[PDB]
């Protein structure tokens, strides 16, 4: 009789190697203090 | 006679504060009689 290849158990001669891509990353703007904060840290503003 | 509500601002250690007119008040904003606020700082006599 004939039979499908799926009827025969499969052994692999291939060596596996799983490489995955480094995914995209988004860098948002990020400051510890803005210019507004730096200017506001003064106690008196001469101009105002 | 001028009455003028102003912004006041104080920096640490909060022993004095300024007014928007550029006038220093040589006194803690948190000075008072209760909850230990009588020990914070005052440059002025009691009657003031």
UniProtKB/Swiss-Prot annotation, chain A:
Q: Which domain of life is it from?
A: Viruses
Per the UniProt record, the source organism is Human herpesvirus 1 (strain 17) (HHV-1)
Q: What does this protein do?
A: Envelope glycoprotein that forms spikes at the surface of virion envelope and binds to the host cell entry receptors MYH9/NMMHC-IIA and MYH10/NMMHC-IIB, promoting the virus entry into host cells. Essential for the initial attachment to heparan sulfate moieties of the host cell surface proteoglycans. Involved in fusion of viral and cellular membranes leading to virus entry into the host cell: following initial binding to its host cell entry receptors, membrane fusion is mediated by the fusion machinery composed at least of gB and the heterodimer gH/gL.
Relative to the complete UniProt sequence, the shown stretch is 657 to 704 of 904
Task: Cite the post-translational modification comment.
Answer: The cytoplasmic tail is phosphorylated by the viral kinase US3. Phosphorylation may be linked to a down-regulation of gB expression on cell surface. ubiquitinated.
Where it sits in the cell: the answer is: Virion membrane; Host cell membrane; Host endosome membrane; Host Golgi apparatus membrane
Q: Provide the glycosylation site positions.
A: 18
Q: How does the record describe its quaternary structure?
A: Homotrimer; disulfide-linked. Interacts with host receptor MYH9/NMMHC-IIA. Interacts with host receptor MYH10/NMMHC-IIB. Binds to heparan sulfate proteoglycans. Interacts with gH/gL heterodimer. Interacts with host DEFA1, DEFA2 and DEFA3; these interactions inhibit viral infection.
Q: Which family does it belong to?
A: Belongs to the herpesviridae glycoprotein B family.
Q: What is this protein called?
A: Envelope glycoprotein B
């Amino acid at each position: 009789h004939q039979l499908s290849r799926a009827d025969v158990t499969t052994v692999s001669t291939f060596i596996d190697l799983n490489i995955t891509m480094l995914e995209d990353h988004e860098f948002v703007p990020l400051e510890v203090y803005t210019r507004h904060e730096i200017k506001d840290s003064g106690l008196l503003d001469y101009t105002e | 006679c001028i009455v003028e509500e102003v912004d006041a601002r104080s920096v640490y250690p909060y022993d004095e504060f300024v007014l928007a007119t550029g006038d220093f008040v040589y006194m803690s904003p948190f000075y008072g009689y209760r909850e230990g606020s009588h020990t914070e700082h005052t440059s002025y006599a009691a009657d003031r």
